[PDB]
Design a protein around this ligand. Structure first.
Ligand code: MG
Ligand code: MG
Ligand code: MG
Length: 127
RNA sequence: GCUCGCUGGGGAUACUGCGGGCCUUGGGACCGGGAGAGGCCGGGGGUACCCCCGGGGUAGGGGUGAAAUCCUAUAAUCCCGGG
């Protein structure tokens, strides 16, 4: 019939990870990060690295019979930043251009109800 | 005039003091329907986070103005089921 999967996208200020699994989440189809396609640490979070990694992952998934995906995009969350980096939308767009159908899109950043304390002291980074 | 201080008598009763009597405006007591993260004791939860075990996957993850120490083939980062 139709084999649908899930694309988990992890976006921070330092890197991007694109991880395609099956509908239940328990079996991995492909997994590509920014440091696997570019050679400079400075370029790992850039949008272009996101496009390259997304294209590699989409090809590997298409060869194995996946037809479309649902998307789950997240920032680090927790006691770290709640805002996704610059490579989220670029990764989302490059999946559709590569041949997959796109289902529903949502963000699953984990948000505390007044949880743990953040690193940096009571004055924070002083640069 | 000064030593502004003392002492014997007579008079007055507004104010202050002392004795009695009568009040309710200040203050306190009590009754009614409501408001509030006021305090203490007992019970039940919420996400997040860290560690441990099992399944997948395979070469990087993390971090900076730029880097390196550090973590990772005893299988990490990432995803799933439990404690
Ligand atoms: Mg890297
Ligand atoms: Mg300075
Ligand atoms: Mg394991």
């Amino acid at each position: 019939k139709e084999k649908w999967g899930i694309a988990h996208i992890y976006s921070s200020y330092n890197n991007t990870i694109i991880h395609i699994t099956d509908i239940t989440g328990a079996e991995t189809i492909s997994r590509w990060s920014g440091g696997m396609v570019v050679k400079a640490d400075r370029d790992e979070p850039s949008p272009y690295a996101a496009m390259l990694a997304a294209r590699r992952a989409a090809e590997e998934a298409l060869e194995k019979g996946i037809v479309g995906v649902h998307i789950r995009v997240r920032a680090p969350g927790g006691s770290k930043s709640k805002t996704p980096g610059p490579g989220a939308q670029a990764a989302i767009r490059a999946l559709a251009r590569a041949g997959l159908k796109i289902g529903r899109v949502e963000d699953v950043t984990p948000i505390p109800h007044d949880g743990t304390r953040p690193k940096g002291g009571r004055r924070g980074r002083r640069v």
